[model samples]
Target chain A: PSQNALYLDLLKKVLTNTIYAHTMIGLERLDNLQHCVEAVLADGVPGDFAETGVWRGGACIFMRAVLQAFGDTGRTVWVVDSFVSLETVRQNFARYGLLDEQVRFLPGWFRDTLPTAPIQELAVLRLDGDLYESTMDSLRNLYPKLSPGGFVIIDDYFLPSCQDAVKGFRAELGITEPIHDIDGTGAYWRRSW
Target chain B: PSQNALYLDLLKKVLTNTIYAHTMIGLERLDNLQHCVEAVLADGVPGDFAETGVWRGGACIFMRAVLQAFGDTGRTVWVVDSFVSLETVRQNFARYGLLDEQVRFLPGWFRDTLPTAPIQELAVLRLDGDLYESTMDSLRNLYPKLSPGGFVIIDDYFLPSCQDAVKGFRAELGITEPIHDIDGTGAYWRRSW
Candidate 1:
């Protein structure tokens, strides 16, 4: 009852080629991340795509390719970014050439710049904001839009302030287990309701 | 120095949708399996795709779609299957609509049926014969063609006989830790040499 290993192999190729374009923007481990995503999406979950704090857009570019490959043209990829340099992140983004695309870049403080549309079938939501206020604000604005069984990813969840945001978000949303962390920079949660 | 949570969320969505077809095949715990494959194939890996004992060809079909998405038309996918159902596997194939044109089902013993072609880069190889003789012979023939960093997946690795075949193959091949049991039904090995 398993998929042919060949399929898995091709998927790996897509992920690596898409994410490795930026020398400085490395990806989280692919093992658990690929499988969890596969299982959840196989159940016919519906939603749009959104990413907060896109740097030069390497990951988002990859995401766009993947969505196109899957024949999901209707899905919207909301790319959130400040475009300006923050202390540490500026260095990472600079190394990756992530500051070019203005259309994909949502340039403003995440808290004030959050989208206000009513949340419908939210498919994927990515958060890279490092501060608690931005993280909290992003969550508050997007949580209502997250579709059932959709995935929420936090880029700085392992950090102190970001961890606090996750803790509070889980309590408020009744999410029990903090989703499995991918490396030290990200964590995932599947919305059940 | 990480992406925002929204970016991670979008990644999760894309990854999930990319591998959704495989999950519909009743393959449990697929998240880690996909991740492991992605990690190995990210770079510094070489091989063509091959799958022995393709049931209804759902996995191989999915693999083809993935390859097309990645624009990798140079790679060849060698699908090996007897097409004759042993027991319940026929039902599995029927359920998935695999008895079709997507895969070339070899109608004989895998060991005898496999052509002696000089396949240089074996990227992904899937083995699914249930019997020990079949499994052993399939591995013996396919092992050498596996390119460096290529992946070999063994279906039915948890079965007593299949496990013995894997153990014997590893010992003879001098491979210690490359083989991994995936979801209890199969194991995967990445050829480093």
Candidate 2:
């Protein structure tokens, strides 16, 4: 297909705006995560949406906006978050102007907060659980449900603990191929059927 | 710079290797010209290069390959062609796996051909000289004085008369754009300046 300059331009504008807004609100790199989310979805793959550690759901709300724009009517977006946030996360939400009602708060850890109904057409699955156990459990629950040609975006892939989890999991599963790294932090892998 | 995996696997071994080795030769897509040249110049931009016709240069070989690879090489490329061609161009070179070469001999009717000297530093000049006047003048006057960052390629741009002259002059000039019609009929641009 021919390259769509207009679509690309819109994506760029949204990313830039989000970054600037996040910075103005005192959030260090939250906007960068949102940019990653937008980019992966822009690729036009099929999949429901899911995110671990939604905190105040600022990022999830942005994802919802994208879904709405793309006319993803039936897609179910699973937002996993412990509403009782840690001191740092709560402070981050308040400082970033993300203390809003848009994000649905599921009061449980990602491991315990599993989506019962699998959204068959999985387009983007975002993992933000920083810890190893929570991250792995979320993946184990979601991986089987991810649609073919879907994308799995792992945030904090560079963190020592998270990196260890990825390495161990890949080694155990014999997943030798390289994942596409975006701006050094987030990693995306296309699941092949 | 080396060829990308996709190019190496699809075009290089299958087409370039086949032709360069003289196993079986045929016309190739013009699009490949840009990719191949760009891949070779990936490490750094080279000095100068030239193409006969700019008919979009099929992604502008100099921009994609030479200039992109080598940056600003202080020199000029002698783009020599009439931007038109006649029937004999096909009869003489078509069967010999050189018809593709004729396409690069553009008959310089469109005022696309740049001048001979004082070449621009980051410029890629295209020559499309089809008629007798353009062909002889391009070679006798422009060939010997190509500066660095200069490349001289001819295109049939159309066919025959223009093709004949370019074929005659190819040996005399001793410089040729890696000819291919993969994307369409045309020549290539490269530079050593």
Candidate 3:
């Protein structure tokens, strides 16, 4: 039940560490991310992890922690954010002493960069770009890259616009997996192979 | 990750079972239940598990299996069904060799049985009654018994009447936890403690 205990614990520390990262999510969302990432890692799921919006990198930092704690060198943790004044996401990695090679950042909006993000496949795709256009843009450009049995996490699924984009795109692609509640706002689903 | 190798394997078997339960729920809903149960049992959360209107009781059986596989002895798997034409549930359990001691059956209509059911606490409550009155009645009587951080699953959340009952009850309760889509039809939420 407690999968990836070490990694999940480290994530908790970083997410709750006020000096390192301001926690944008609650315990349930953290549990959600931990389980998804643990599933991909435990199942030896072959793909990188990707997040469209990295707000100060709190969640993305946890993404990096999972790979590092699990010592998964075969995949990348892709970060996409811009105009976000993001410093802590990058700095916190050093504070945790994680190597630069564990993660890679694509500093731009999804409309400008995701279409050519070079991400071949995603084991876990976190959509935090909280807008209809932003959510749809990330889904349109990145969803097909999510691997079978991989997780697609929506950090703002409770937002009407974010929900609209997710609903529209999943319908467009005929992806009918259940999207489960994570805390109050976030939700996620695993693609069926 | 695979929460329990044995239980998940059994779920796969039944979801694809031929002579036994024909799976009405998809893998996503299956996964949804898996994680919900996992969270409740993992945290040493105090409560039992219950399901209303189990058709073949595959999900309910899986819940029992989780408790069994996880070696949880303190809780009971409450089965609320009527007409008692439930050979499949009992038969399937026998096939899996699940003891009758692991589960407690409440054999009656929700309108009649749930009101005074001598249940104290629940960590996971799955509602699949598929009727407005049933849904409302279950929530009215049982929602208070759900442990804080407990899972409340409405498997027919997409049905208009079911949705109406769920929405009406939640609004009445002033529950603010976000309800998430499970397979675009079923939905669930954890009661805030």
Candidate 4:
């Protein structure tokens, strides 16, 4: 409990958009994100933690906090977003004493940056982009690189455009994993191959 | 750090075999055991934790402590050992306030109990029997039920008899995963399928 207590506290801050007021994601959605990150770390899944549309970087900050709490030294948290300045996100991370080489930022639109990104694999791939293009781009480029047993979370699942994109991608890939709910606005599924 | 502090403290006590004087498995082996459990829990691996040949039951006790500290309420720990009295081990658990349904004891030799044991799958399959027969029986019966990303720990890897059993089993199954060192006396490998 001692180790996860810090995580729980961070979850509360991120959910309420307090402390950093850095994230617009709600309690349940952010909570699900933490669970995915914890599972990846505990399972020893080979990949980094990543979010496709980090706004103010609360979710990414929480990701780093989880790694630190568990003493995980290998994995990095990739903060990917369009116009997502590395300097801005790094500052957010520094405020939490989490700024380091482990927190990497991929700045550019998903379509322009994701396809050729140096990322080899992902343990937790979060998609917060609200448009069909953003969601589809992320899925096409990054989904193939997700490790089996890793998790894919759709933070804007409540949006019609985002939901359609998810359904289309999963159908195209023949992914049958059941999507688990998080506060109705978000959902996630674990790769079971 | 607070949540995992309990686990680290527990690791030290088990390694020294001091607090309960219950485990003869030395520091490195016991430390490795904790790592496997944490990985299984973090990965959200779907399986129970099991140890073949738990002596005074120190290792299993540590497994339960890990689940409790991490707030994992679903998984159980299987304690399999010849002459491993449930009463004796339960008393050991009681000392740590860990006696519960999560710690299931199978008091019999590996060959007799493991083959038909109702255990569905294992995330951490630890083989501690020091002899060839004991080690062989465990791998043949339990390895089949280990989860894809789970860990297999050979506690007596330094023993020629035990080492031969492991080598023979892996050779027969065509398992080529590299074994990692643990305190020279034990070794581990993760199932990558």
- What is the per-residue lDDT of model 1 for residues A1-193, given as tens digits with 9 covering 90 to 100? 2233333333344335441122123545334334444444566667766677666454554444344334345555565666624333333333322233221335577666776443455667777758777787888888778778878877667888788887897789777844776777777878775
Provide the lowest-lDDT 10-residue window in model 4 chain A.
Answer: A11-20
For candidate 4, what is the lDDT?
Answer: 0.79
Better of 1 and 3 by DockQ: 1
The most accurate candidate by TM-score is 4
1 versus 3: better lDDT goes to: 3
* Candidate 3 lDDT over residue span A1-193, tens digit each: 3434533553464365421134577666777888799899888778998888777666776777677656677888887877446565676555444538868888876688888888999999987847777788888888888899899999889888778778889889898998888777888888997
Measured with C-alpha atoms, the lDDT of residue B131 in candidate 2 is 68
Error of 3 at A41 (Å): 26
Badly placed stretches (over 4 Å) of model 4 are: A18-20, B1-193
- lDDT by residue for model 2 over B1-193, one digit each (tens)? 4322222222222222331121121224333444544543453443344544343232232232233223434433333334324344332233222233213333444234435333333223345555676566655555555445444444443366766676677666675555434223445455454
Rank by TM-score, highest first: 4, 3, 1, 2
**Each candidate's root-mean-square deviation in Å?**
17.9, 18.6, 19.5, 17.2
In the range B1-193, model 3's lDDT, one tens digit per residue, is 3444533543444444421143477667877898898898776668999988787777777788777667677889988888436675677566544547878888887778888898999998888848877788888898899988899998879988888788789899898899888788899988776
Which candidate has the highest lDDT of all? 4
Tell me how each candidate scores on DockQ against the true complex: 0.02, 0.01, 0.01, 0.02
Model 3: lDDT equals 0.75
lDDT for each residue of candidate 1 in B1-193, tens digit (9 for 90 to 100): 2112222222233333432122223333233334433444466466667777666444554444344434455566566766535333333333323333333345566666765644555777777757777777777887778777777776667788878877888889788755666676766776675
Regions more than 4 Å wrong, model 2:
A1-44, A84-105, A115-121, B1-193
Model 2 chain B: ten consecutive residues of lowest lDDT:
B18-27
Give the CAPRI class of candidate 4: incorrect
